[PDB]
Amino acid sequence: PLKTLVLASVVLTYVLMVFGGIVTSTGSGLGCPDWPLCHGQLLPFQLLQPWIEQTHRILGGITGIVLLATLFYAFKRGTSFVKKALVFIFIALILEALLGMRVVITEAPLLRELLHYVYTSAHLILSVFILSTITITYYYVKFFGERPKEYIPYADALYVATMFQILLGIFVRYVKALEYNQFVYYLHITYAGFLVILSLFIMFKEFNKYSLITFLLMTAQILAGVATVISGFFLPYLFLHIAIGFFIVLWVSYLVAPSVLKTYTE
Amino acid sequence: PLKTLVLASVVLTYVLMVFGGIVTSTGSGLGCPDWPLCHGQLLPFQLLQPWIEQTHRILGGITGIVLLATLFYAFKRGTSFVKKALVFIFIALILEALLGMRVVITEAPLLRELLHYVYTSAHLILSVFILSTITITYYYVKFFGERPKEYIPYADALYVATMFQILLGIFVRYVKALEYNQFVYYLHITYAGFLVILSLFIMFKEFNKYSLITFLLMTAQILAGVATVISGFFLPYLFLHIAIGFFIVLWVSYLVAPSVLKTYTE
Amino acid sequence: PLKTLVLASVVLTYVLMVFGGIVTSTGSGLGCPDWPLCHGQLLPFQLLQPWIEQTHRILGGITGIVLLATLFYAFKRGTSFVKKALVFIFIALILEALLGMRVVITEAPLLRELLHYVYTSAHLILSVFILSTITITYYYVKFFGERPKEYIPYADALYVATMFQILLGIFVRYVKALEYNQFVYYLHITYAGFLVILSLFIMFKEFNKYSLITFLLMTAQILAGVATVISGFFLPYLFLHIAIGFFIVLWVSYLVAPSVLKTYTE
Ligand SMILES: CCCCCCCC/C=C\CCCCCCCC(=O)O[C@@H](COC(=O)CCCCCCCCCCCCCCC)COP(=O)([O-])OCC[N+](C)(C)C
Ligand SMILES: CCCCCCCC/C=C\CCCCCCCC(=O)O[C@@H](COC(=O)CCCCCCCCCCCCCCC)COP(=O)([O-])OCC[N+](C)(C)C
Ligand SMILES: CCCCCCCC/C=C\CCCCCCCC(=O)O[C@@H](COC(=O)CCCCCCCCCCCCCCC)COP(=O)([O-])OCC[N+](C)(C)C
Ligand SMILES: CCCCCCCC/C=C\CCCCCCCC(=O)O[C@@H](COC(=O)CCCCCCCCCCCCCCC)COP(=O)([O-])OCC[N+](C)(C)C
Ligand SMILES: CCCCCCCC/C=C\CCCCCCCC(=O)O[C@@H](COC(=O)CCCCCCCCCCCCCCC)COP(=O)([O-])OCC[N+](C)(C)C
Ligand SMILES: CCCCCCCC/C=C\CCCCCCCC(=O)O[C@@H](COC(=O)CCCCCCCCCCCCCCC)COP(=O)([O-])OCC[N+](C)(C)C
Ligand SMILES: CCCCCCCC/C=C\CCCCCCCC(=O)O[C@@H](COC(=O)CCCCCCCCCCCCCCC)COP(=O)([O-])OCC[N+](C)(C)C
Ligand SMILES: CCCCCCCC/C=C\CCCCCCCC(=O)O[C@@H](COC(=O)CCCCCCCCCCCCCCC)COP(=O)([O-])OCC[N+](C)(C)C
Ligand SMILES: CCCCCCCC/C=C\CCCCCCCC(=O)O[C@@H](COC(=O)CCCCCCCCCCCCCCC)COP(=O)([O-])OCC[N+](C)(C)C
Ligand code: HEM
Ligand code: HEM
Ligand code: HEM
């Protein structure tokens, strides 16, 4: 029962994060006649269906329900790892809720804008942390008595590099400091090359289906990212990029889980 | 016979790549009286002997001949690794040939300039991939029955970091997006420090002749890079930098080969 | 007796480096009435108590004395590792002394300014190298007959990444090339995120007091760095940042020492 709950929570979390990145994609009012076929906002240095909103609310509610059910079942017939993982997920959720409470610290326009950037980026950072933790937990509930066979030669370094790239993408999306947004965009597009090189070396070190899928995911995300940039900010291209990025988060978490858990017991 | 062919192909590939980087160095017409003693083009943000051409053509022809001979001898009395390596080298060569065919995709000036940058950078990226693959193959044909003793403590991480630095250098050389060229130049000069730190730590972890040579190669390349920049773009300084960079590519490929091949059979 | 000398040299070196970064912090004349409560110089792109000086001189003299005593006792009843470490510390000290001798190479204003940046940055780089080497030596003199148990899962990668971040901070502090200073400042603040991610993954891989302390040190340094930037350059915030950064240097050196020394004898 716990395995089904954690798998459902992984799915719901991924779908909710992708959905939020699809409504929030230059959709504060989802303007233009082409709901999903109208260019989004360009990067600063380069310068309304009630259905989507109600289904976003429903998705948030249902994923909260399952996360609560998973938390309750973690302490019932669950190991210490699952309890700790859940606790870290719900601490992140509480942090997101507190970030929602935007009690005014200072009305200073500069520090106001910065704090707005901090809140917006921290929401996505906590979402990515929740997704990674729940994916590692989902791996943990499986293979519990099994011997944790590995999947790729360098999951750890790949995990860290991928998470840094995800952080760069979040900064590009939300940190609109203009000089820093341009810098972080150019660091993002360039570090994509490091990710490609690392995936190629991983595939060379041990070629299996997982290495090939990792390289193909990198290449599909890079291609998608470029496309999004090749022509304005087409919503469909911007979406596919978001979906592939969050699935890459999930994929690297799942690939890193066996390397870390191989040193555990049972 | 195969070992001699792969060694000759390694030499020819390195010499051809260096030569191309010596003619292409601000030598579209090789202007100025000092054929090799006249400053080259500065970076965008900072703003004709028939012999060389005919010997470049001869070198390209002879290296193509050997690569073809090596490909033919790979399938004759060769292992699967050598066949795959050759196939990946000739796929890269076919990709370079297709990049030579610059059928007009779009006349859009922006997307035209970008695609020009993509073609120019991809040629060098494929050249570096070919050099690395042929160096790993040359290591493979040697020590075939021998036990693959290691040379440096961290060849893999060193290989990945060095390849990322080479990619940065290629982007600086060819990607003239001005804002991005300045960014990538400053990322190149700064990541050189990371390479120096990594080489120093490698030398500390296990000091032998290979670690010392790696550190000295980094230091000679950094010094050369600075010199090239200290005074305009003197061709001799620009050349030595190119030669040392491509030899660093070869060196890190040769150093990484034993770490990856230690997990193979025979 | 050697262990006491190396521990004293570690302390003196850390305190002298921190002190120098506290006087040199926009204190060429230590102007403004608030000796330690007056904003320092902003970054270029963003635009006198005799006691402190005499105690800085006294601290330099006493730390030189101990370093000399440690060097003398290294060759007396000391192993080869300690002799080599001392020799590398005193070579760095001789290099610092030579950098003090600023014989005029070229009066070219550009190359003069660059060379000034090179001297100022190289002084701090040599100081950090001395601190790291003396911390590794202090670890070596302890546990000499003991089995070198590890402290954190990834000390090496953490050491290299931390040293690169320290290099970035030194460049931000001293390299005032304006376009490059802005770039390196934005690379510093962004690579702090990579350091946080790496520390989090380290803590996940093996949670103990050392992993928690490493993560807390990163987080305290990041917080301090931001504060320094949140409001001008308050001297107290600027100081705490310097002190935490140099202690992070010492901490990562101490954490990396057991991983490298585990492959040694005795
Ligand atoms: C967990 C793993 C990831 C960790 C990532 C840590 C990363 C830490 C990164 C460093 C953060 C601090 C950066 C420096 C602050 C001062 C910036 C200032 O100098 O402006 C600079 C820009 O720089 C800014 O644009 C950067 C903004 C980054 C926001 C990061 C949010 C992190 C949320 C963390 C959530 C943690 C989890 C949730 C909480 C538990 C200068 O540019 P400007 O302002 O444009 O200057 C002109 C302005 N003017 C035109 C108006 C005149
Ligand atoms: C700026 C510069 C940036 C770039 C710098 C360079 C960056 C890249 C640097 C790292 C790569 C360098 C590789 C050099 C040696 C290659 C040899 C290899 O091909 O043979 C090996 C193939 O197993 C894998 O190595 C094959 C995948 C290698 C990548 C090939 C291209 C990617 C597409 C791939 C997919 C499309 C393929 C389409 C064609 C079929 C031999 O293995 P095996 O003996 O057959 O099997 C036993 C070994 N095993 C037990 C572990 C499995
Ligand atoms: C943009 C998105 C791109 C997505 C790309 C996806 C690429 C995915 C590529 C494939 C990745 C998965 C490959 C799994 C292979 C496992 C093999 C091995 O581990 O055997 C294991 C099986 O494990 C399987 O049963 C797990 C199957 C999981 C399917 C996941 C589908 C993901 C869809 C993603 C959709 C994303 C959403 C898309 C729309 C938004 C072990 O099995 P066993 O040994 O038999 O154990 C029995 C032991 N016993 C007998 C004791 C009981
Ligand atoms: C294999 C290992 C290495 C992999 C590396 C992968 C790296 C992928 C990297 C990302 C590539 C895509 C980058 C973003 C595209 C849009 C850029 C646009 O925003 O312009 C931006 C610049 O940015 C550009 O200057 C960057 C150009 C990089 C070219 C890289 C070629 C890669 C070849 C791959 C070959 C693969 C092998 C061969 C094929 C199999 C903005 O700047 P601007 O344009 O100046 O704006 C003003 C313009 N104006 C003044 C005119 C108004
Ligand atoms: C922003 C800051 C950036 C910088 C941050 C720091 C970056 C650097 C951080 C990593 C280095 C930190 C080292 C600290 C400890 C040094 C101890 C070492 O010297 O002794 C060791 C020497 O073996 C090697 O360690 C010697 C090479 C070390 C580098 C010396 C400087 C480079 C020049 C070197 C060449 C010129 C030498 C010229 C003088 C002769 C002791 O080894 P052993 O016991 O004698 O032998 C047995 C061990 N063995 C079996 C493995 C072989
Ligand atoms: C800018 C360029 C800078 C270049 C810097 C170069 C620095 C180079 C520094 C030296 C690097 C090479 C050191 C090799 C040491 C090997 C030791 C060990 O492995 O023994 C091996 C020998 O292996 C040797 O035979 C290989 C010799 C290769 C020489 C390469 C010269 C490179 C020149 C580059 C010119 C570049 C072009 C320059 C002009 C453009 C094994 O031997 P064995 O054990 O006897 O095996 C017998 C087994 N059996 C008995 C069963 C049969
Ligand atoms: C050991 C581990 C760490 C190693 C780190 C190695 C790092 C090597 C890094 C590369 C160093 C060389 C950089 C390029 C040189 C040319 C720069 C030039 O293009 O200016 C560029 C800026 O770029 C500069 O601002 C960068 C300055 C970096 C100083 C680094 C000191 C290293 C000390 C090492 C001590 C070693 C130990 C002590 C000695 C044994 C362009 O910007 P600009 O100039 O502003 O242009 C306009 C100027 N104008 C407005 C006037 C018109
Ligand atoms: C752009 C995006 C950037 C971010 C991307 C993600 C970046 C981060 C990615 C890496 C972290 C991902 C972790 C996922 C799984 C977590 C499971 C873990 O909690 O349980 C484990 C706890 O042991 C440690 O793992 C606990 C520390 C984990 C970090 C928790 C937050 C940091 C605060 C922590 C301190 C405050 C805690 C406050 C609350 C108490 C279970 O271990 P155990 O079974 O109990 O013990 C046996 C195992 N042992 C023998 C090895 C010890
Ligand atoms: C901004 C600064 C932030 C500082 C944050 C500091 C955080 C520090 C957090 C704590 C870090 C230290 C934890 C050590 C735990 C060791 C446990 C284990 O190794 O046992 C070892 C003990 O080792 C101890 O005796 C060493 C004690 C060192 C104390 C260092 C204090 C640092 C203060 C920093 C002040 C900085 C300056 C601040 C002001 C400028 C082994 O012992 P044993 O097994 O009994 O061996 C006996 C064997 N026999 C019996 C055969 C003889
Ligand atoms: C290689 C060329 C790439 C380009 C041109 C590119 C482009 C972009 C752009 C323009 C954004 C801003 C999105 C917005 O403003 O709405 C973005 C965000 C992002 N990028 Fe990239 N990208 C590239 C590579 C990558 C890679 C390789 C990854 C991951 C492995 C990645 C992950 C992300 C993520 C996670 C985001 C944030 C999505 C969100 O916040 O919902 N990108 N990218
Ligand atoms: C440390 C200071 C460095 C400086 C100042 C520097 C400078 C430069 C410059 C200006 C270019 C552009 C060449 C051109 O336009 O023709 C370049 C290219 C390049 N650099 Fe650096 N560099 C440095 C370090 C390094 C290091 C450490 C490496 C490799 C380990 C490296 C590898 C390369 C490569 C491969 C190229 C491309 C050569 C080619 O395309 O033929 N550089 N460098
Ligand atoms: C995360 C946000 C950070 C910000 C906003 C920040 C800010 C700064 C600034 C403005 C300086 C210039 C100091 C000066 O001009 O006097 C500096 C220097 C420095 N930073 Fe950071 N920093 C951050 C993170 C870090 C981290 C994570 C580390 C190390 C792990 C670090 C280490 C250093 C060091 C060593 C210096 C040089 C101190 C000296 O030269 O005495 N910083 N930082």
Which residues of chain A lie closer than 8 angstroms to C230, CB-CB?
A: 111, 114
- Residue of chain A whose alpha carbon sits nearest to that of C231: A111
Q: After which residues is chain B broken (C to N over 2.5 A)?
A: 47
Shortest-distance Cα residue to atom 37 of ligand 1: A122
* Distance of alpha carbon B150 from alpha carbon B30, whole angstroms: 44
Q: Residues enclosing ligand 10, CB less than 6 A? A: A 21, 25, 124, 162, 165-166, 169-170, 172-173, 188-189, 192, 195, 218, 221-222, 225-226, 228-229, 238, 241-242, 245, 248
C-beta separation of A183 from A191 below 8 A? no
Q: Which two tokens stand for residue B164?
A: 């990322």
DSSP secondary structure string, C168-195? Answer: HHHHHHH---THHHHHHHHHHHHHHHHH
CB contact under 8 A, B160 and A186: no
Pairs of CB atoms within 8 A across A/B = 38
Packing angle of the helix pair B179-205, C179-205 (nearest 10 deg):
50
Length of chain B: 266
CB neighbours (10 Å) of residue B206?
A: 15
C-beta separation of C261 from C148 below 8 A? yes
CB neighbours (10 Å) of residue C156?
A: 21
Å resolution of this model? Answer: 2.8
C-beta separation of B136 from B256 below 8 A? yes
User: Which method was used?
Assistant: cryo-EM
Residue C128's closest CA among C2, C211, C262, C252? C252
CA distances from C61 to A53, A174, B37, C65, C134 (A): 69, 51, 50, 6, 18
Under DSSP, is residue A189 helix (H, G, I), strand (E, B) or coil?
helix
* Distance of alpha carbon A34 from alpha carbon A50, whole angstroms: 15
C-beta separation of A172 from A43 below 8 A? yes
CA distances from C264 to C143, C145, C146 (A): 12, 11, 12
DSSP secondary structure string, B77-118? Answer: S--HHHHHHHHHHHHHHHHHHHHH----S---HHHHHHHHHH
C-beta separation of C177 from A233 below 8 A? no
* Distance of alpha carbon A205 from alpha carbon B168, whole angstroms: 23
Q: Which two tokens stand for residue A227?
A: 């496309």
DSSP secondary structure string, B233-255? Answer: T-HHHHHHHHHHHHHHHHHHHHH
CB neighbours (10 Å) of residue B213?
A: 16
Taking an 8 Å Cβ-Cβ cutoff, which residues of chain A contact chain C?
A: 111, 114, 156-157, 159-160, 163-164, 167-168, 171, 179-180, 183-184, 187, 260, 263
Burial call C1-31: b when 16+ CB within 10 Å, e when fewer:
ebeebbbbbbebbbebbbbbbbebbbbeebe
- Cα separation of the two ends of chain B: 19
* Distance of alpha carbon A88 from alpha carbon C20, whole angstroms: 41
Binding site, annotated residues of A:
188, 241
Cα Rg of chain A (Å, integer): 19
CA distances from C15 to A190, B148, C60 (A): 39, 47, 10
Burial call C82-91: b when 16+ CB within 10 Å, e when fewer:
beebbebbbe
**C262 DSSP assignment:** T
C-beta separation of B150 from B95 below 8 A? no
Packing angle of the helix pair B80-100, B50-75 (nearest 10 deg):
140
Tokens 């965008």 map to which residue?
B44
Find the CB nearest B164 among A182, A197, A204: A197
Fill in the amino acid letter for A122.
Answer: A
Packing angle of the helix pair A155-174, A109-141 (nearest 10 deg):
150
CB neighbours (10 Å) of residue B113?
A: 12
